[PDB]
CSV table of C-alpha atoms and ligand atoms in Angstrom, one decimal:
chain,number,residue,atom,x,y,z
L,37,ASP,CA,108.2,62.4,117.4
L,38,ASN,CA,108.2,65.6,114.9
L,39,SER,CA,111.0,64.2,112.7
L,40,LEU,CA,108.6,63.4,109.7
L,41,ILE,CA,107.5,66.9,109.2
L,42,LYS,CA,109.8,69.0,106.5
L,43,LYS,CA,111.9,71.4,108.5
L,44,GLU,CA,112.1,74.1,106.2
L,45,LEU,CA,109.1,76.1,104.5
L,46,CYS,CA,108.4,76.0,100.9
L,47,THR,CA,109.4,79.1,100.2
L,48,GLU,CA,112.9,80.0,99.3
L,49,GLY,CA,114.8,82.7,101.3
L,50,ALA,CA,111.5,82.9,103.8
L,51,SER,CA,111.4,86.1,106.1
L,52,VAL,CA,113.0,85.5,109.8
L,53,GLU,CA,109.2,85.9,111.7
L,54,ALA,CA,108.0,83.0,108.8
L,55,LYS,CA,110.9,80.6,110.1
L,56,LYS,CA,110.5,81.2,113.5
L,57,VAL,CA,106.4,80.7,113.3
L,58,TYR,CA,106.8,77.5,111.8
L,59,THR,CA,109.7,75.9,113.4
L,60,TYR,CA,107.4,76.7,116.7
L,61,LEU,CA,104.5,75.0,114.9
L,62,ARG,CA,106.6,71.8,114.2
L,63,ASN,CA,107.9,72.3,117.7
L,64,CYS,CA,104.5,71.6,118.6
L,65,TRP,CA,103.4,69.0,116.4
L,66,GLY,CA,101.9,65.8,118.6
L,67,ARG,CA,102.2,68.1,122.1
L,68,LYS,CA,99.8,71.1,121.6
L,69,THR,CA,97.0,72.2,119.6
L,70,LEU,CA,96.9,75.9,118.9
L,71,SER,CA,93.5,77.6,119.2
L,72,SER,CA,92.3,80.6,116.6
L,73,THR,CA,89.0,82.4,116.0
L,74,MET,CA,88.0,83.9,112.3
L,75,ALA,CA,87.2,87.5,111.8
L,76,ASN,CA,83.6,88.8,111.7
L,77,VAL,CA,83.8,88.5,108.1
L,78,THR,CA,86.7,89.7,107.1
L,79,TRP,CA,88.7,92.6,108.8
L,80,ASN,CA,88.8,92.1,112.6
L,81,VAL,CA,89.3,90.5,115.7
L,82,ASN,CA,85.6,90.4,117.1
L,83,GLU,CA,85.2,86.9,117.6
L,84,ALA,CA,88.8,87.1,119.5
L,85,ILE,CA,87.4,89.8,121.7
L,86,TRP,CA,84.5,87.6,122.0
L,87,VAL,CA,86.0,84.2,123.0
L,88,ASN,CA,88.5,86.6,125.6
L,89,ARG,CA,85.1,87.8,127.4
L,90,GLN,CA,83.3,84.5,127.4
L,91,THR,CA,86.5,82.5,128.7
L,92,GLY,CA,89.3,85.4,130.3
L,93,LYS,CA,91.8,84.0,127.8
L,94,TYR,CA,92.5,85.2,124.0
L,95,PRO,CA,93.1,82.4,121.2
L,96,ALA,CA,96.5,82.0,119.8
L,97,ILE,CA,96.1,82.4,116.1
L,98,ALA,CA,93.4,85.3,114.2
L,99,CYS,CA,92.8,84.7,111.1
L,100,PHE,CA,91.5,87.4,108.0
L,101,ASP,CA,90.0,87.6,105.0
L,102,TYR,CA,90.6,89.2,101.6
L,103,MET,CA,87.3,88.6,100.5
L,104,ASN,CA,86.6,92.2,99.7
L,105,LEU,CA,88.8,92.8,97.3
L,106,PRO,CA,86.6,93.8,94.8
L,107,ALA,CA,85.1,96.8,97.2
L,108,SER,CA,88.3,97.7,98.6
L,109,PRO,CA,89.6,100.3,99.3
L,110,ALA,CA,86.6,102.0,100.7
L,111,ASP,CA,85.1,104.3,103.6
L,112,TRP,CA,83.7,100.5,104.9
L,113,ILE,CA,87.1,98.5,104.1
L,114,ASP,CA,90.1,99.1,103.6
L,115,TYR,CA,93.0,96.4,103.5
L,116,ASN,CA,95.6,99.5,103.1
L,117,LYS,CA,94.5,100.1,106.6
L,118,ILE,CA,96.5,97.3,108.4
L,119,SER,CA,96.1,98.3,112.0
L,120,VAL,CA,94.0,95.8,113.2
L,121,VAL,CA,96.9,92.9,112.2
L,122,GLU,CA,100.1,94.9,113.6
L,123,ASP,CA,97.7,95.3,116.6
L,124,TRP,CA,97.2,91.8,116.9
L,125,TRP,CA,100.4,90.7,115.6
L,126,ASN,CA,102.3,93.1,118.2
L,127,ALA,CA,100.0,91.8,121.2
L,128,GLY,CA,101.9,88.9,121.0
L,129,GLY,CA,99.2,86.5,118.3
L,130,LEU,CA,99.6,85.0,115.6
L,131,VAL,CA,98.1,86.0,111.9
L,132,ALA,CA,96.4,83.9,109.4
L,133,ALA,CA,94.4,84.8,106.3
L,134,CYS,CA,91.8,83.1,104.0
L,135,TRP,CA,90.7,84.5,101.1
L,136,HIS,CA,86.6,83.9,99.5
L,137,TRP,CA,88.3,84.7,95.7
L,138,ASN,CA,84.4,86.8,94.8
L,139,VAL,CA,84.7,87.1,91.1
L,140,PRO,CA,81.8,88.7,89.0
L,141,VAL,CA,78.3,86.8,89.0
L,142,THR,CA,78.3,87.6,85.3
L,143,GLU,CA,80.0,89.8,82.5
L,144,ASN,CA,80.1,93.5,83.6
L,145,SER,CA,78.3,92.4,86.9
L,146,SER,CA,78.8,94.7,89.9
L,147,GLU,CA,77.9,91.9,92.2
L,148,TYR,CA,80.7,89.4,93.6
L,149,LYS,CA,80.5,86.1,94.6
L,150,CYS,CA,82.5,82.9,95.5
L,151,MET,CA,80.3,79.7,95.1
L,152,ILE,CA,79.3,78.0,91.9
L,153,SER,CA,75.8,78.4,92.1
L,154,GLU,CA,75.6,82.1,92.7
L,155,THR,CA,78.6,82.8,89.9
L,156,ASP,CA,79.2,81.5,86.5
L,157,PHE,CA,82.7,82.3,86.5
L,158,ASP,CA,84.8,79.9,84.4
L,159,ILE,CA,88.1,78.8,85.6
L,160,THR,CA,89.0,77.1,82.3
L,161,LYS,CA,89.1,80.9,80.5
L,162,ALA,CA,90.7,82.6,83.3
L,163,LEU,CA,93.7,80.8,82.8
L,164,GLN,CA,93.7,81.5,79.0
L,165,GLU,CA,96.0,84.4,78.4
L,166,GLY,CA,94.0,87.7,77.8
L,167,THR,CA,90.6,86.5,78.1
L,168,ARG,CA,88.2,88.7,80.6
L,169,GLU,CA,88.4,86.0,83.0
L,170,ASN,CA,92.2,85.9,83.0
L,171,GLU,CA,92.3,90.0,83.5
L,172,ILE,CA,90.1,89.7,86.1
L,173,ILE,CA,92.2,87.3,88.5
L,174,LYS,CA,95.8,89.1,87.3
L,175,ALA,CA,94.3,92.4,88.7
L,176,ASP,CA,92.8,90.8,91.6
L,177,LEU,CA,96.7,89.2,92.6
L,178,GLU,CA,98.3,92.1,91.9
L,179,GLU,CA,95.9,94.6,93.9
L,180,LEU,CA,96.0,91.2,96.8
L,181,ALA,CA,100.0,91.4,96.8
L,182,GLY,CA,100.3,94.9,97.7
L,183,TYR,CA,98.1,94.1,100.8
L,184,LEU,CA,100.3,91.5,101.2
L,185,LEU,CA,103.3,93.3,101.1
L,186,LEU,CA,102.2,96.1,103.3
L,187,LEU,CA,102.3,93.7,105.9
L,188,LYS,CA,105.9,92.0,105.0
L,189,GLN,CA,106.9,95.4,105.1
L,190,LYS,CA,105.9,95.4,108.6
L,191,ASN,CA,107.7,92.2,109.3
L,192,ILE,CA,104.5,90.2,109.7
L,193,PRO,CA,104.5,86.6,108.5
L,194,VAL,CA,100.9,85.4,107.3
L,195,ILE,CA,99.5,81.5,108.0
L,196,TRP,CA,97.9,81.9,104.5
L,197,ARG,CA,95.5,79.7,103.2
L,198,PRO,CA,93.9,80.4,99.6
L,199,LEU,CA,91.9,78.3,97.1
L,200,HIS,CA,90.1,76.1,100.0
L,201,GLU,CA,87.7,73.6,100.2
L,202,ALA,CA,88.9,72.6,96.9
L,203,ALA,CA,87.6,69.2,95.7
L,204,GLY,CA,84.5,70.4,97.6
L,205,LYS,CA,83.6,71.8,94.0
L,206,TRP,CA,81.4,74.5,95.4
L,207,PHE,CA,83.3,77.1,94.8
L,208,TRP,CA,84.5,78.4,91.2
L,209,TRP,CA,87.8,77.3,91.7
L,210,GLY,CA,86.8,73.5,92.1
L,211,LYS,CA,85.6,72.8,88.7
L,212,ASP,CA,88.8,70.0,88.2
L,213,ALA,CA,92.1,69.3,89.9
L,214,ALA,CA,94.0,70.1,86.6
L,215,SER,CA,92.6,73.7,86.6
L,216,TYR,CA,92.9,74.3,90.2
L,217,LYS,CA,96.5,73.4,90.5
L,218,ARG,CA,97.1,75.3,87.4
L,219,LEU,CA,95.5,78.3,89.4
L,220,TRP,CA,97.3,77.4,92.9
L,221,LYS,CA,100.9,77.7,91.0
L,222,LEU,CA,99.7,80.9,88.9
L,223,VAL,CA,99.2,82.4,92.8
L,224,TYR,CA,102.1,81.4,94.0
L,225,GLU,CA,104.3,82.5,91.2
L,226,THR,CA,103.0,85.9,91.0
L,227,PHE,CA,103.3,86.6,95.3
L,228,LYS,CA,106.8,85.3,94.5
L,229,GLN,CA,107.6,87.6,91.8
L,230,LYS,CA,106.5,90.6,93.9
L,231,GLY,CA,108.8,89.0,96.7
L,232,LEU,CA,106.2,87.4,98.8
L,233,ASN,CA,108.5,85.5,101.1
L,234,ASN,CA,106.2,85.8,104.9
L,235,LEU,CA,103.8,83.5,104.1
L,236,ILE,CA,103.3,80.1,105.1
L,237,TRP,CA,101.0,78.4,102.5
L,238,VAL,CA,98.5,75.9,104.0
L,239,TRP,CA,96.6,73.2,101.4
L,240,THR,CA,93.3,72.6,102.8
L,241,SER,CA,92.2,69.1,101.4
L,242,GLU,CA,88.6,67.4,101.7
L,243,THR,CA,90.3,63.8,102.4
L,244,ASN,CA,91.1,61.6,99.7
L,245,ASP,CA,91.9,64.3,97.2
L,246,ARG,CA,95.6,63.9,96.2
L,247,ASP,CA,94.7,64.6,92.6
L,248,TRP,CA,93.5,68.0,93.8
L,249,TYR,CA,97.5,68.3,96.4
L,250,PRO,CA,99.1,71.6,94.4
L,251,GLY,CA,102.7,69.8,95.1
L,252,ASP,CA,105.2,69.9,97.5
L,253,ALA,CA,106.9,72.7,96.0
L,254,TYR,CA,103.8,75.2,96.9
L,255,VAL,CA,102.3,74.1,100.3
L,256,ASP,CA,103.5,73.6,104.0
L,257,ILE,CA,100.6,72.9,105.7
L,258,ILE,CA,97.5,70.8,105.3
L,259,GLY,CA,94.4,71.9,106.8
L,260,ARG,CA,90.6,70.1,107.2
L,261,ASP,CA,87.4,72.1,107.1
L,262,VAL,CA,84.8,70.5,109.2
L,263,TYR,CA,81.3,71.2,110.4
L,264,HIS,CA,78.3,69.1,112.2
L,265,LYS,CA,80.7,66.3,113.1
L,266,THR,CA,80.2,65.3,117.1
L,267,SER,CA,81.4,62.5,117.6
L,268,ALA,CA,85.2,62.7,118.2
L,269,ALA,CA,85.9,59.1,116.6
L,270,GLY,CA,85.0,60.3,113.3
L,271,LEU,CA,87.1,63.5,113.8
L,272,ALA,CA,90.3,61.2,114.7
L,273,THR,CA,90.0,59.1,111.8
L,274,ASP,CA,90.4,62.4,109.5
L,275,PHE,CA,93.0,63.6,110.9
L,276,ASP,CA,94.7,60.4,111.0
L,277,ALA,CA,93.6,59.9,107.1
L,278,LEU,CA,95.5,62.7,106.5
L,279,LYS,CA,98.5,62.0,108.4
L,280,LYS,CA,99.3,59.0,106.4
L,281,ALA,CA,97.9,60.9,103.5
L,282,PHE,CA,100.9,63.9,104.3
L,283,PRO,CA,103.4,62.3,106.6
L,284,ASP,CA,106.0,65.5,106.6
L,285,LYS,CA,103.5,68.2,106.9
L,286,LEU,CA,101.1,69.3,110.3
L,287,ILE,CA,97.8,69.1,109.8
L,288,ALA,CA,95.3,71.7,111.1
L,289,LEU,CA,91.6,71.7,111.8
L,290,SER,CA,91.6,75.3,109.6
L,291,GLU,CA,87.5,75.8,109.8
L,292,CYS,CA,85.1,74.0,112.1
L,293,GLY,CA,82.0,74.5,113.9
L,294,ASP,CA,79.6,72.5,115.4
L,295,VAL,CA,82.1,69.8,116.5
L,296,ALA,CA,82.8,67.2,119.5
L,297,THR,CA,84.5,69.2,122.4
L,298,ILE,CA,88.5,69.4,121.8
L,299,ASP,CA,88.9,67.1,125.0
L,300,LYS,CA,86.7,64.5,123.5
L,301,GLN,CA,89.2,64.8,120.1
L,302,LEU,CA,92.5,64.8,122.1
L,303,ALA,CA,91.4,61.9,123.8
L,304,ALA,CA,90.2,59.9,120.4
L,305,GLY,CA,93.7,61.3,119.3
L,306,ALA,CA,92.9,64.2,116.6
L,307,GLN,CA,96.1,66.3,117.3
L,308,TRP,CA,95.6,69.0,115.2
L,309,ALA,CA,98.0,71.7,114.9
L,310,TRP,CA,95.5,74.3,115.5
L,311,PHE,CA,92.0,74.9,115.0
L,312,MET,CA,89.7,77.8,114.0
L,313,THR,CA,86.6,78.1,114.8
L,314,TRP,CA,84.2,79.8,112.1
L,315,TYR,CA,82.0,83.1,113.6
L,316,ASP,CA,78.5,83.9,114.3
L,317,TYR,CA,78.0,86.9,112.0
L,318,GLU,CA,74.9,88.2,114.3
L,319,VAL,CA,76.5,87.5,117.4
L,320,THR,CA,80.3,89.3,116.8
L,321,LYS,CA,79.8,92.1,114.3
L,322,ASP,CA,79.2,94.9,116.8
L,323,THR,CA,81.3,94.5,119.7
L,324,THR,CA,79.1,96.8,121.7
L,325,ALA,CA,75.6,95.2,121.0
L,326,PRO,CA,73.7,93.0,123.7
L,327,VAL,CA,73.8,89.8,121.7
L,328,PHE,CA,77.4,90.1,122.1
L,329,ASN,CA,77.3,89.4,125.7
L,330,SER,CA,74.9,86.2,125.3
L,331,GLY,CA,77.2,83.6,125.5
L,332,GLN,CA,75.5,81.5,122.6
L,333,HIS,CA,77.3,80.7,119.5
L,334,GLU,CA,76.3,79.2,116.2
L,335,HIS,CA,79.3,77.4,115.8
L,336,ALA,CA,81.5,77.4,119.1
L,337,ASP,CA,79.7,78.4,122.3
L,338,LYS,CA,81.3,79.9,125.6
L,339,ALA,CA,80.9,76.2,126.9
L,340,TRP,CA,83.1,74.9,124.8
L,341,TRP,CA,85.5,77.3,124.3
L,342,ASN,CA,85.6,77.2,128.3
L,343,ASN,CA,86.2,73.5,127.9
L,344,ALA,CA,89.2,73.7,125.2
L,345,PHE,CA,91.0,76.4,127.0
L,346,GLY,CA,90.7,74.0,130.1
L,347,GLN,CA,92.6,71.4,128.4
L,348,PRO,CA,96.5,71.1,128.6
L,349,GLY,CA,97.4,70.6,125.1
L,350,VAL,CA,95.6,74.3,123.9
L,351,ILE,CA,97.6,76.9,123.4
L,352,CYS,CA,96.1,80.3,124.2
L,353,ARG,CA,97.7,83.6,123.2
L,354,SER,CA,99.7,84.5,126.6
L,355,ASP,CA,101.2,80.6,126.2
L,356,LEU,CA,102.9,81.7,123.1
L,357,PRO,CA,106.8,83.1,123.2
L,358,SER,CA,107.7,86.2,120.9
L,359,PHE,CA,108.1,85.7,117.7
L,360,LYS,CA,109.9,89.2,117.0
L,361,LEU,CA,113.6,90.0,117.3
Z,401,LIG,O1,81.0,95.1,97.2
Z,401,LIG,C1,80.9,93.5,96.7
Z,401,LIG,C2,80.4,92.7,98.2
Z,401,LIG,O2,79.3,93.3,98.5
Z,401,LIG,C3,78.1,92.4,99.5
Z,401,LIG,O3,79.0,91.8,100.3
Z,401,LIG,C4,79.3,93.3,101.3
Z,401,LIG,C5,78.3,92.6,103.0
Z,401,LIG,O4,79.4,91.7,103.3
Z,401,LIG,C6,78.2,91.3,104.2
Z,401,LIG,O5,78.8,90.1,105.1
Z,401,LIG,C7,78.5,89.2,104.2
Z,401,LIG,C8,79.4,88.2,103.5
Z,401,LIG,O6,79.3,89.3,101.8
Z,401,LIG,C9,79.5,87.0,102.8
Z,401,LIG,O7,78.4,87.1,101.7
Z,401,LIG,C10,79.4,86.2,104.0
Z,401,LIG,O8,79.2,84.8,103.4
Z,401,LIG,C11,79.8,84.0,104.3
Z,401,LIG,C12,78.7,82.9,104.8
Z,401,LIG,O9,77.5,83.7,105.4
Z,401,LIG,C13,79.0,81.8,105.6
Z,401,LIG,O10,79.4,81.9,107.3
Z,401,LIG,C14,80.5,81.3,104.7
Z,401,LIG,O11,80.5,79.8,105.7
Z,401,LIG,O12,81.5,81.5,105.0
Z,401,LIG,C15,80.9,82.8,104.4
Z,401,LIG,C16,82.3,84.0,104.0
Z,401,LIG,O13,82.8,84.8,104.9
Z,401,LIG,O14,78.4,86.4,105.0
Z,401,LIG,C17,78.1,87.6,105.4
Z,401,LIG,C18,77.1,87.6,106.2
Z,401,LIG,O15,75.9,88.4,105.5
Z,401,LIG,C19,78.2,92.3,105.7
Z,401,LIG,O16,79.9,92.8,105.7
Z,401,LIG,C20,78.0,93.8,105.1
Z,401,LIG,O17,78.3,94.7,106.0
Z,401,LIG,C21,78.7,94.4,103.9
Z,401,LIG,O18,78.0,95.1,103.2
Z,401,LIG,C22,78.9,96.3,103.5
Z,401,LIG,O19,77.8,96.8,104.7
Z,401,LIG,C23,78.1,97.9,104.8
Z,401,LIG,C24,77.7,98.8,106.1
Z,401,LIG,O20,77.7,97.7,107.1
Z,401,LIG,C25,78.1,99.7,103.8
Z,401,LIG,O21,78.4,100.8,104.1
Z,401,LIG,C26,78.6,98.5,102.5
Z,401,LIG,O22,78.1,99.5,101.6
Z,401,LIG,C27,78.1,97.2,102.2
Z,401,LIG,O23,76.9,97.2,101.8
Z,401,LIG,C28,78.2,90.7,98.8
Z,401,LIG,O24,77.9,89.8,99.6
Z,401,LIG,C29,79.8,90.2,98.5
Z,401,LIG,O25,80.0,89.1,97.8
Z,401,LIG,C30,80.3,91.4,97.2
Z,401,LIG,O26,79.7,91.6,96.3
Z,402,CA,CA1,89.3,96.9,94.8
Z,403,CL,CL1,95.2,84.7,126.5
C-alpha cells in the first residue's frame, strides 16, 4: 500500500516526463528498489559502464554532479555538452543530479571547495543582498539554471538532489538550520523563476534533523547517505526512522558505500526507493585502463553488485518502462 505517499510533485505544472517518473517511483514503493551509480566525479556514466562489465546489467539511474560550475565551460568540462545525459536518457535510463556547490576558499581565491574545513565561505553573508558572497551564489544559480534548462528543453526530467547532508555540518551550507532553509528556498524560487518544471526535488536527511527540513512546498523525496554500515538491521532502523518522520514521501538511499548487501537490507525491511553507490575515482576514471577490469571497488565491488542484481526486488535499466511519449 502506497496511499500515504503524496501523489503530486511539489512543483506546479511539473513536466509530463517528470510526472511519469514520479508516478512510476510511487508505484514501485514497497515493492521494488531502483539501482543507481554515480558519475566518476561529474559528467560521464563511467560507473554505469563498469557495473555492466562486472554484471551484464546497467543500473536504472545514472547521477551527474554540477560541482564544476567555476571551471565550466572549459575544454575538460562543459555542462552545455549534454550529450552524455541525453544518450543515457535515450537508452532508457533515469537521470539524476547532485551538486557539490564549490565556492572560493577565500575572497578572490581561484580555488573552489565545499567543505567547511577547506573554505571560509559564510552562508550568513551569502544571504545578505549584494555582498560578495551573495553575488557569487546568485551567479552560480543563474549559470546552473541555464545548464538545467538545456535538459528541460530536451524534455529530460532530473531527480535533483542539491544541498545535501546539511545537518552533518561539514559543508559550508550546514552552518545552521535557519540559514540552510533560507538557502534552499532561494534555490527553489530561483529555479521556478527560470521555468524549471522538470525537477524532482530530493532532500537529504541525516535522520532526526526535522529542523533542517526545508518544508513540503520545496521537497518531493527524502534521501539518506550512509557509508561503512554493514549491519542490515542498522540500515533498516534508519529506513524506518525516516519513514516515521516523513510518512508521505519516498525514502531513498541516495549515497552508499561499504554497506550490507541489498539482499540483507531487504530481508531486514529496508525497502529504499533506490540506492546509489558512490564512485571510486581511480578505478572508473578511464574506461580503457587495466584497473577498470579488476572488479575491485572501494564502495561496491563486483560481488556486491552481482548480489544486488540477483534479487527480485531490484530494478536494472532494462526493467524500466518507457518514460517518453
Ligand atoms: O576548477 C576548480 C576546481 O579544480 C579542482 O578540481 C578539478 C579536478 O577534479 C578532480 O576530481 C576531484 C574533485 O575535484 C573533488 O575534489 C572530488 O571530491 C570528492 C571526494 O574525493 C569524495 O569522493 C567525496 O565523497 O566526494 C567529492 C565530490 O566528488 O575528488 C576528485 C578526485 O580527487 C579530477 O576530476 C581532475 O581531473 C580535475 O582537474 C582537471 O583535470 C583535467 C585533466 O584531468 C585538467 O585538464 C584540468 O585543468 C583540471 O585540472 C578542485 O579540486 C576543485 O575543488 C575546484 O577548485
Ligand atoms: Ca562557470
Ligand atoms: Cl540492463
